[PDB]
Every structure is written in C-alpha cells, then in structure tokens.
C-alpha cells in the first residue's frame, strides 16, 4: 500500500483505458477501410456494368 | 413505394433433409459481426 | 540457354507491369455477409475489384521468339539426327507442345 504501487494502479487504469481506446480506434478505422472498399466493388460492378 | 423499404448499409441477412443442413449460414454470419 | 535468356525476359516483364495481392477478398466478403441482402456470397468467393494486366505487344513478341529459340533446338537436332542424344522422343513431343 506504499504510493509507488498507488501510482503504479494509476498506471493500471490510465493505461488500460488508453488501450481499450485505441482499440476501438483499430476497430472503427480498419471499419471504414472496408467502407470504401466495398463501394469502389460497388463502383467495380456498376461501371463494367 | 407504400409501407416497408430497405436501406443500404443495414444488416439484414436472412431468416425463417438438405436445405435445412444449412444452419451453418447464421453461424457465419454471427461469426462476421465478431 | 536462349530459352533461359527469353524466360528472365519473360519473368521481368510480367515483374514491371506488376499484380495486386487482394488480401482482403475475405473480408470485404464478410461486410457483404450482412450488409446486402443477396444470398450469393455465402458459399461463394468474393471475386477481385479489378482483373490481372494483358500480356502486351513486345511481351507477346518474347513469347513468340521463344517459340522460335524451342523450335530451332527441336529442328537443328532432327536435321543432326546423326548423334543420338538428340531430344529423346519424350522430348520429342515435349519440347515442340510447349514452344507452340
């Protein structure tokens, strides 16, 4: 209970918010990668079309 | 148009011997949202 | 060897004008699972965005003239047919397939 591992549990929460941060961050980007993708496939079909 | 439309970008995959041994499609389609 | 020569010509060629990997097809195979309502992509494969580049005019002419390199080594040995390890007949059909 000394604030060496009072600061380091401060580490625990800052830390692990950040990751569940970036993350979601990985999740709604490479989203969005396949957003475009699939509508230049879109755009693909519609054109040879 | 009068009553239900579908809009793009929803997810709407499907729903209800051999054409009932395909059960296995919700199964990757649960497994795609994962 | 003049095979060999015209296959590093062949290999470099088709190096230049270059393929993309589509690494994705999976995936952009899975937003398609349940955004669009069509049954096709389930027990099939997401085909590519874009297809493979054409063979072109010059690396059309390096296959022709290794055509010419495979069939000159089939003919030079028929007309010197006086030395028996010449194209054995297994090569025979072999060789003058795969140059046409």
Redesign the interface.
């Given at each position: 209970s000394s604030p060496s591992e009072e600061a380091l549990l401060e580490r625990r929460r800052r830390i692990d918010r950040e990751l569940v941060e970036k993350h979601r961050q990985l999740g709604q980007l490479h989203s969005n990668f396949l957003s475009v993708q699939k509508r230049i496939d879109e755009a693909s079909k519609n054109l040879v079309g | 148009a009068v009553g239900n439309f579908?809009l793009?970008?929803?997810?709407?995959?499907?729903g209800g011997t051999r054409q009932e041994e395909a059960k296995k499609?919700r199964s990757?389609?649960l497994d795609?949202?994962r | 060897e003049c095979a060999w020569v015209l296959r590093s010509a062949l290999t470099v060629a088709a190096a230049m004008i270059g393929n993309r990997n589509y690494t994705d097809r999976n995936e952009v195979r899975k937003l398609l699972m349940l955004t669009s309502l069509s049954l096709k992509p389930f027990r099939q494969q997401l085909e590519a965005t874009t297809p493979r580049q054409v063979t072109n005019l010059r690396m059309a002419g390096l296959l022709r003239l290794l055509a010419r390199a495979k069939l000159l080594w089939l003919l030079d040995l028929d007309q010197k047919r006086k030395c028996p390890t010449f194209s054995s007949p297994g090569n025979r059909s072999d060789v003058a397939t795969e140059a046409c």
């Open positions: - | 579908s793009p970008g929803f997810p709407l995959m499907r499609d990757k389609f795609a949202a | -």
